Amino acid sequence: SHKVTKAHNGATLTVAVGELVEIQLPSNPTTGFAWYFEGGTKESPNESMFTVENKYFPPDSKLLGAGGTEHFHVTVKAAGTHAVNLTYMRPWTGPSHDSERFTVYLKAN
Amino acid sequence: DLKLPASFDAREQWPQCPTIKEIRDQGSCGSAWAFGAVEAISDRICIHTNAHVSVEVSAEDLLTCCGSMCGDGCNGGYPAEAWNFWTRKGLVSGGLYESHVGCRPYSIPPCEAHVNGARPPCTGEGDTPKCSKICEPGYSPTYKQDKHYGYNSYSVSNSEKDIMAEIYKNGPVEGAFSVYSDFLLYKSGVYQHVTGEMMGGHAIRILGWGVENGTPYWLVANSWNTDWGDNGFFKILRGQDHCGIESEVVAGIPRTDQ
C-alpha cells in the first residue's frame, strides 16, 4: 500500500501482481463533484487488468461543504503497465478537456 | 383555522417573486451553506413586501464577509450562523456568475457542461474570494445603502407540521441533510436513500411539499445549477426525518425595506 496522492500524479509505480496500491485524492461531493473512471463509474475499466474498491471520507462535522478525501484501493491482477485514469467531474455533466485528471501507472512483472 | 393543504408550492403561492423559481450554482466552492441562506432570504423579502421588493441577495457577500462566525468560506460553513449575520450586518444584492445583477454578483463560475472555453474552468481547489465592500461598476446604490437586514433568525423544530406551518406562513426555509452517493444521479420523483456511501451534510432550500404516487415529499432547491436533477429542484421523502432533512431547519423574518 503506497499512499499515492496528487503530488504523485503521473508516476509509474512498480508493484507485484496481487499488491494493493492506495490512492488518496481530495474530493468535495457536496459541490456535485467526485472522482470517476472514464464514463462516470468507480469500477475498474478492465477487471482482468486491475480491480478497484473505493471509499469517501467526509469530515465528520457540521462544517457543511468542507472537502474530504476519496480512497481508491487498486489491486493489480496481471503483468504489464496499467494506467489508472481518474477524472474529477459532476457525473451528470460529463468531463471536458479542462477537467482535473489524475493518473498513475502500475507496472507489474 | 390551522388547516394545512395537502400540497403547497411557494412558486405558486407567490407567483410574482421570481427568485423563488431561481436555481443558482455554487460552482466548485463548498458554499451551499451560504446559498441555502441567501436563496430563502431573497424569497422571504419578496414575500414580506407582497412583491414590491424582489432582489437576489448576494451569496458572494455572505461567503466572503461573514468570517469566523460562519465557518470557512469555500471550505464549508454553518447555516444558522449565516442567518444571524444577516440580522447583524445585513447582505447586499448580487446575482449569478457574470450576470451584472446587483451589488456583488457571484464570482465563481458555474459547472454545468460547457464547450469551447469562453469561461474560466471549475477546479477542485479554489480560494474563498476577499471581502470587498464595494459594488460592481455600473451598479448605482453604494454598498452600505444596498444592505438588506433580518429582524430575527431561529431554528424550526424537528417536526413535519412545524416546518410546513413555517413555510406556509413565512416562506421558504434553509435546511440540511445527509448526502449519499445515489443522490448525485437523482433525476425525478421522490428521492429516498437506498444505496451509496455517505458524502457529508449539505445545505439546501425547502420551498413546499406534496404527495407523488402516494409518497409525501418536500420540494427542495439544490445549488448545482438547472442541469442537475429536476431542473435544479428535487423532491425528498417527508415525515420520517429522512436523511435528517427535518432536523436542522433555520429561518428568519426580514426587516421591512420596501
Coordinates of C-alpha atoms in Angstrom, one line a residue, chain B residues 19-219:
Chain B
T19 CA -36.3 34.4 -7.1
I20 CA -38.4 31.5 -5.7
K21 CA -38.2 29.8 -9.1
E22 CA -34.4 30.6 -9.5
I23 CA -31.7 28.0 -9.3
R24 CA -28.2 29.0 -8.5
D25 CA -24.8 27.2 -8.9
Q26 CA -22.3 27.3 -6.1
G27 CA -19.6 26.0 -8.6
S28 CA -16.6 24.3 -7.1
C29 CA -16.8 26.1 -3.8
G30 CA -18.2 24.5 -0.6
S31 CA -20.7 27.4 -0.2
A32 CA -24.1 25.7 -0.2
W33 CA -24.4 26.8 3.4
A34 CA -24.5 30.4 2.1
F35 CA -26.7 29.7 -1.0
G36 CA -29.4 28.0 1.0
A37 CA -29.5 31.1 3.2
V38 CA -29.5 33.9 0.6
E39 CA -31.9 32.0 -1.6
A40 CA -34.6 31.7 1.2
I41 CA -33.8 35.2 2.3
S42 CA -34.4 36.6 -1.2
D43 CA -37.7 34.7 -1.3
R44 CA -38.8 36.0 2.1
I45 CA -38.0 39.6 1.3
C46 CA -40.3 39.4 -1.7
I47 CA -43.0 37.6 0.2
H48 CA -42.7 40.0 3.1
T49 CA -43.3 43.0 0.8
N50 CA -46.0 41.4 -1.4
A51 CA -43.6 41.5 -4.4
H52 CA -42.8 45.2 -4.1
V53 CA -39.2 44.3 -3.4
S54 CA -37.7 41.5 -5.4
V55 CA -33.9 41.2 -5.1
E56 CA -31.3 38.5 -5.5
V57 CA -29.4 38.6 -2.2
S58 CA -25.7 38.2 -2.6
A59 CA -24.1 34.7 -1.9
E60 CA -20.8 36.5 -2.5
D61 CA -21.3 39.0 0.3
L62 CA -22.2 36.3 2.8
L63 CA -19.5 33.9 1.6
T64 CA -16.8 36.4 1.9
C65 CA -17.7 38.8 4.7
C66 CA -19.1 36.6 7.4
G67 CA -15.7 35.2 8.6
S68 CA -15.4 33.1 11.8
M69 CA -19.0 33.1 12.8
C70 CA -19.9 31.4 9.5
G71 CA -17.1 28.8 9.2
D72 CA -14.5 28.7 6.4
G73 CA -15.9 30.3 3.2
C74 CA -15.5 27.9 0.2
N75 CA -14.3 25.3 2.6
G76 CA -17.7 25.0 4.3
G77 CA -19.9 26.8 6.7
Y78 CA -22.8 27.0 9.1
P79 CA -26.5 27.8 8.0
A80 CA -27.8 29.1 11.4
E81 CA -24.9 31.5 11.6
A82 CA -25.5 32.8 8.1
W83 CA -29.0 34.0 9.1
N84 CA -27.5 35.5 12.3
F85 CA -25.1 37.5 10.1
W86 CA -28.0 38.8 8.0
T87 CA -29.6 40.1 11.2
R88 CA -26.4 41.8 12.4
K89 CA -24.5 43.0 9.3
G90 CA -27.1 42.6 6.5
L91 CA -26.4 41.5 3.0
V92 CA -26.2 43.3 -0.3
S93 CA -27.8 42.3 -3.6
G94 CA -25.9 40.1 -6.2
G95 CA -26.9 37.7 -8.9
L96 CA -25.5 34.8 -10.9
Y97 CA -22.0 34.5 -12.4
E98 CA -21.3 37.3 -14.9
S99 CA -25.0 38.4 -14.7
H100 CA -24.0 42.0 -13.8
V101 CA -27.0 41.9 -11.5
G102 CA -26.8 43.7 -8.2
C103 CA -24.0 44.9 -6.0
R104 CA -21.9 41.7 -5.7
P105 CA -22.7 39.0 -8.3
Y106 CA -21.2 35.6 -7.6
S107 CA -17.6 35.5 -8.8
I108 CA -17.2 31.7 -9.1
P109 CA -18.0 30.2 -12.4
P110 CA -20.9 27.6 -12.9
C111 CA -20.0 24.0 -13.6
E112 CA -22.7 22.7 -16.0
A113 CA -21.5 21.1 -19.2
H114 CA -19.5 23.8 -21.2
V115 CA -17.8 23.8 -24.6
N116 CA -15.1 25.7 -26.5
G117 CA -13.9 27.7 -23.4
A118 CA -15.5 31.1 -23.2
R119 CA -15.4 30.7 -19.4
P120 CA -12.8 30.1 -16.6
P121 CA -12.9 26.4 -15.6
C122 CA -14.2 24.6 -12.4
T123 CA -11.5 23.3 -10.2
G124 CA -11.4 21.2 -7.0
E125 CA -9.1 23.7 -5.3
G126 CA -10.4 27.3 -5.1
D127 CA -9.8 30.1 -2.8
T128 CA -12.6 32.0 -0.9
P129 CA -12.7 35.4 -2.6
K130 CA -11.9 38.5 -0.5
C131 CA -14.5 40.6 1.4
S132 CA -14.7 43.6 -0.9
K133 CA -17.1 46.2 0.4
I134 CA -17.7 47.8 -3.0
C135 CA -20.4 47.4 -5.6
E136 CA -19.8 46.2 -9.1
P137 CA -19.2 49.0 -11.7
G138 CA -22.4 50.2 -13.2
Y139 CA -24.5 49.3 -10.1
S140 CA -25.7 52.5 -8.7
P141 CA -26.5 52.3 -4.9
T142 CA -23.4 52.2 -2.7
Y143 CA -22.5 49.0 -0.8
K144 CA -23.8 50.3 2.5
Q145 CA -27.0 51.6 1.0
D146 CA -27.7 48.2 -0.6
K147 CA -27.8 46.2 2.6
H148 CA -30.8 44.1 3.5
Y149 CA -31.3 43.1 7.2
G150 CA -33.0 40.4 9.1
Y151 CA -35.4 41.1 12.0
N152 CA -34.5 37.7 13.6
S153 CA -33.2 34.2 12.9
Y154 CA -34.3 31.0 14.6
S155 CA -34.4 27.2 14.4
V156 CA -37.5 25.5 13.4
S157 CA -38.3 22.3 15.4
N158 CA -37.8 18.8 14.0
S159 CA -41.4 18.4 13.3
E160 CA -43.0 18.0 9.9
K161 CA -46.1 20.0 10.8
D162 CA -44.0 22.9 12.3
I163 CA -41.8 23.1 9.1
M164 CA -44.9 23.1 6.9
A165 CA -46.5 25.8 9.1
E166 CA -43.3 27.8 8.8
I167 CA -43.1 27.6 5.1
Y168 CA -46.9 28.3 4.6
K169 CA -46.8 31.4 6.8
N170 CA -43.3 33.0 6.3
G171 CA -41.8 31.5 3.1
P172 CA -39.0 29.0 2.1
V173 CA -36.5 27.9 4.7
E174 CA -32.9 26.6 4.7
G175 CA -32.3 23.0 5.8
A176 CA -29.6 20.5 5.7
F177 CA -29.5 16.7 5.1
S178 CA -27.0 13.9 4.7
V179 CA -25.9 13.3 1.0
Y180 CA -25.4 9.7 -0.1
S181 CA -23.9 8.8 -3.4
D182 CA -27.2 7.8 -5.0
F183 CA -28.4 11.4 -4.6
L184 CA -25.9 12.7 -7.3
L185 CA -27.8 10.9 -10.1
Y186 CA -31.3 12.0 -8.9
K187 CA -33.5 12.9 -11.9
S188 CA -37.2 12.8 -10.9
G189 CA -39.8 11.6 -8.4
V190 CA -39.3 11.4 -4.7
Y191 CA -35.7 10.9 -3.5
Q192 CA -35.2 8.2 -0.9
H193 CA -31.8 7.0 0.1
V194 CA -31.4 3.4 -1.0
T195 CA -27.7 2.9 -1.9
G196 CA -24.4 4.5 -1.9
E197 CA -21.9 5.8 0.6
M198 CA -22.3 8.8 2.9
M199 CA -20.9 12.0 1.4
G200 CA -21.5 14.6 4.1
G201 CA -24.1 17.1 5.1
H202 CA -25.5 19.5 2.5
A203 CA -27.4 22.8 2.9
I204 CA -30.5 23.4 0.7
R205 CA -33.7 25.5 0.4
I206 CA -37.1 23.9 1.2
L207 CA -40.0 25.6 -0.6
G208 CA -43.0 23.4 -0.3
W209 CA -44.5 19.9 0.0
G210 CA -46.8 17.5 -1.7
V211 CA -47.6 13.8 -2.4
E212 CA -46.5 12.0 -5.5
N213 CA -47.7 8.4 -6.3
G214 CA -48.8 8.2 -2.6
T215 CA -45.4 9.3 -1.3
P216 CA -45.2 12.5 0.8
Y217 CA -42.4 14.8 -0.1
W218 CA -40.6 18.1 0.5
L219 CA -39.9 20.3 -2.6

